Amino acid sequence: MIQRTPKIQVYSRHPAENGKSNFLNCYVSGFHPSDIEVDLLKNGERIEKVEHSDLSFSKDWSFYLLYYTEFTPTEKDEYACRVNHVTLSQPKIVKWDRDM
Amino acid sequence: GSHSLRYFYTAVSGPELREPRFLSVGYVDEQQFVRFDSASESPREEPRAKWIERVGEEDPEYWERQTGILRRNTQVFRVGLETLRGYFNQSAGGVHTLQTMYGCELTPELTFTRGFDQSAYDGRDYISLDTDTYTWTATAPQAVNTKRKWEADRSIAEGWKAYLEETCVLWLKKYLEMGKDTLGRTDPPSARVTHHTDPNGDVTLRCRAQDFYPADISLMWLRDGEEQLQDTEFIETRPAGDGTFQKWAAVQMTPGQEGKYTCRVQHEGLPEPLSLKW
Amino acid sequence: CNVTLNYP
């Protein structure tokens, strides 16, 4: 059985300006098989309704998905993405790095 | 650049799932325009681009038709998950994945170049259609029994040829016109260089591009004329979530050397590439 | 346009 492990990027749709409304993104890709949990965190708490694109996959047959949510960044707020997959021993949390 | 119309079908079996689940997306170029999930309340193909909601007013049964095709494709893949299990002599109960992508491509001038129809079992190439011969390449060795099934019935290759080189071509042209405003746009990138000092004391310059469409882009860090395959890190191109893409290219150096380096950024949308210094 | 696929 082929298993491929998620590659994860946490970033904003537009360049983050505090106080200015944006979208926070979590792009999970290159994984296989397709079963995957993804949540978006604000200060460690699940953000109630994030939306996501419909599972597609790329030429090597690995899957990809985009998880996103409207948000307004500040300085004290910490944002992160949390990803669970059979290739992971426990949920992997990638924190949003504003200049990355 | 190129144009294309592609469908992506994914079916997965599980202990979590009573019957295996079937999912489908369709793309015109790099934009997704339809989707389908066997596990909705009433599974139905649904629009996901604004320009495809047009389709019904000069093709009223469009959504009904697709839906029936995808309900029947749902059972085709469930059956197929069971058949292939046998081919690979596997226990029941497992997690298994069966995938298929198919579609067609045109030149910038809208002429057919290539069709394809390809499948994978459990993330591995299984069988695929050779477009120039319209025979079946069995990549997995136990896909040869599928290969003999499908070659014993000429209407399968015949139906793909008619679909790939005519039906697909004509629907793609129509979609392109229907989606003139969005699918015809070519969007150049905006670009920016950022400066970062690392805890050891060295300097990272990051050449950032965003808001571009299509997703193909060349990011090059030139140290006084010469590419820097050395300390150059890339990130994979990523969707902004609004139709466009983002990519950045980093590079490392000793404080004082910034002025040597340059970032060239070329993309279908830019007259001339972008030269950016810090 | 979606296509009806075949039993493998």
Query: Is chain B adjacent to chain A, meaning 3+ CB pairs within 8 angstroms?
Result: yes
The two three-digit tokens of residue B244, written as one number: 């466009």
Distance of alpha carbon B127 from alpha carbon B118, whole angstroms: 6
Interface test with C, best of B8, B46, B76, B122 (most C CBs within 10 A): B76
How deeply is B142 buried, as exposed, middle or buried, from its count of CB atoms within 10 A (0-12, 13-18, 19+)? Answer: middle
Read off the DSSP letter of residue B78. H
Those residues with Cβ within 8 angstroms of residue A82's Cβ, 6 or more apart along the chain or in another chain: A37, A38, A39, A40, A41, A91, A92, A93, A94
Q: At what angle do helices B144-151 and B154-162 cross, to 10 degrees?
A: 80
- Contact criterion met (CB < 8 Å) for A9 and B238: yes
Neighboring chain C residues of B127 at a CB cutoff of 8 Å = 8
CB–CB contact A25 B122 (8 Å) = no
What is the 8-class DSSP label of residue B13?
E
Nearest Cα of chain B lies from the Cα of A29 at a distance, in angstroms, of 10
Which of A29, A33, A62 lies closest to B12 in CB terms? A33
User: How many CB atoms are located within 10 Å of the residue B14 CB?
Assistant: 16
Q: Do C8 and B100 touch (CB under 8 A)?
A: no
Task: With CB atoms and an 8 Å threshold, state whether B95 touches A68.
Answer: no
**Domain edges within chain A:** 1-100
Q: How far apart are the first and last CA of chain C?
A: 22
> Is C6 in Cβ contact with B70 (below 8 Å)?
no
CB B209 within 8 A of CB B247: yes
Q: Which residues contact B103 (CB under 8 A, 6 or more apart)?
A: B4, B5, B6, B7, B27, B115, B116, B164, B168
Residue B12 CB neighbour total at 10 angstroms: 21
CA distance B67 to chain C (A): 9
Q: Do B241 and A23 touch (CB under 8 A)?
A: yes
Please name the member of B79, B102, B126 whose beta carbon is closest to the beta carbon of C3: B102
Rg (alpha carbons) of chain A, rounded to whole number: 14
Alpha-carbon gap: B97 to the closest alpha carbon of chain A (Å): 7
For residues B208 and B225, give the distance between their C-alpha atoms in angstroms, rounded to a whole number: 19
CA distance A38 to chain B (A): 16
Resolution (A): 2.7
CA distance A33 to B96: 8
Structure obtained using? X-ray
Give the sheet arrangement for strand A79-84, strand by strand.
A45-46, A37-42, A79-84, A92-95
Instruction: Report the C-alpha gap between B178 and B263 in whole angstroms.
Output: 38
**The amino acid at B196:** H
Cβ contact (<8 Å) for A56 and B32? yes
Strands (E), chain B: 3-13, 21-28, 31-37, 46-47, 96-106, 112-121, 124-130, 135-138, 190-197, 203-212, 218-223, 226-227, 233-234, 238-239, 245-253, 261-266, 274-276
**B:C CB pairs within 8 Å:** 44
